[PDB]
């Protein structure tokens, strides 16, 4: 009867420590622990942008009670709801985002994930408001492993290319938050459902079983991944 309506579940990072014996040296922390939680939003009829802001606020509210106090970093959040088309300013030769910033235009609500994380909309109605549905329907869980081909490309170090030409990716933000650039030095550890749906394998990736359909809310103004998503105009 009188239960909660705007709700979803997700798997986030809870702990980030060293091996049981290791002690801080002169990395950061190697052992990572993840756990499922149920996130509850305040009731009401919200738009997609307002729902996305509240969903991100629930993820960060979890990070502030169990995690920040257990060693996890802001660069390890691992679940974010966005609206951008990453890799928009992508260059085929340098394989980096040349403008140095992801295009700040709203295209379609999105799910950005880090390794070991995911979301589950089996008992939720927010997937429909976000226009992300199951193509053929029991169970709706989108994990990091299901988003093959949807890796977010790394941004160019524009401060560096303008020191001469040195093309290199940007490894940290203004406040020294890791952008999670990988060994290939072209891609980022973040994966997004929108990139895997449009740029992944059309008959084997996330598109084969999903369907695209029709300030406290900006705690990381410097981080290009955690920035507040743009609103549709």
Burial of residue 129 (CB within 10 Å: 0-12, 13-18, 19+) is middle
Is residue 12 a contact partner of residue 62, using CB atoms and an 8 Å limit?
Answer: yes
The number of residues making up the chain comes to 233
Residues in 180-199 that interact with a second copy by CB under 8 A? 194, 197-198
Element (H, E) at 126: helix 126-129
Residue 215 in contact with a second copy, rule: CB under 8 A:
yes
- Site stretch for a second copy (CB under 8 A), options 13-21, 62-70, 153-161, 175-183: 62-70
Among residues 28, 31, 36, 43, which is the contact residue for a second copy, using CB under 8 A?
Answer: 43
The order of strands in the sheet holding 141-143 is: 31-40, 7-17, 118-120, 141-143
Smallest gap from Cβ 63 to a second copy, in A, equals 10
Burial of residue 47 (CB within 10 Å: 0-12, 13-18, 19+) is exposed
Residue 26 in contact with a second copy, rule: CB under 8 A:
no
Residues in 130-149 that interact with a second copy by CB under 8 A? 135
Residue 230 in contact with a second copy, rule: CB under 8 A:
no
Residue 127 phi, psi (nearest 5):
-65, -35
By CB under 8 A, how many residues form the interface with a second copy?
A: 40
Residue 208 in contact with a second copy, rule: CB under 8 A:
yes
Residue 167 in contact with a second copy, rule: CB under 8 A:
no
Nearer of residues 22 and 202 to a second copy, judged by Cβ: 202
Residue 7 phi, psi (nearest 5):
-155, 150
155 is written with which tokens?
């941004």
- List interacting residues with a second copy (CB under 8 A): 1-4, 42-45, 50, 57, 61, 64-65, 68-69, 85, 88-93, 99, 103, 105, 107-108, 135, 194, 197-198, 202-203, 207-208, 212, 214-217
């Amino acid at each position: 009867e009188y239960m909660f309506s705007n709700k979803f579940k997700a798997r986030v990072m809870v702990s980030r420590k060293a091996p049981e014996g290791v002690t801080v040296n002169d990395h950061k922390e190697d052992i990572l622990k993840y756990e499922w939680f149920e996130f509850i939003l305040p009731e009401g009829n919200f738009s997609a942008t307002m729902t996305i802001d509240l969903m991100n606020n629930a993820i960060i509210d979890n990070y502030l009670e169990i995690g920040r106090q257990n060693g996890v970093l802001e660069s390890d959040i691992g679940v974010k709801f966005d609206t951008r088309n990453f890799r928009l300013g992508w260059d085929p030769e340098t394989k980096l985002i040349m403008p140095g910033v992801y295009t700040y235009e709203a295209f379609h609500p999105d799910i950005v994930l880090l390794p070991g994380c995911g979301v589950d909309f089996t008992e939720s109605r927010l997937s429909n408001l976000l226009g992300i549905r199951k193509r053929h329907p029991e169970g709706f869980k989108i994990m990091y492993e299901d988003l093959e081909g949807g890796n977010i490309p790394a941004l160019l170090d524009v401060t560096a290319y303008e020191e001469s030409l040195k093309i290199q990716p940007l490894e940290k933000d203004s406040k020294s938050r890791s952008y999670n650039v990988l060994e290939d030095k072209i891609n980022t550890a973040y994966r997004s459902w929108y990139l895997s749906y449009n740029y992944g394998n059309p008959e084997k990736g996330i598109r084969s079983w999903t369907l695209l359909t029709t300030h406290v809310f900006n705690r990381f103004p410097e981080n290009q991944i955690l920035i507040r998503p743009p609103a549709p105009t």
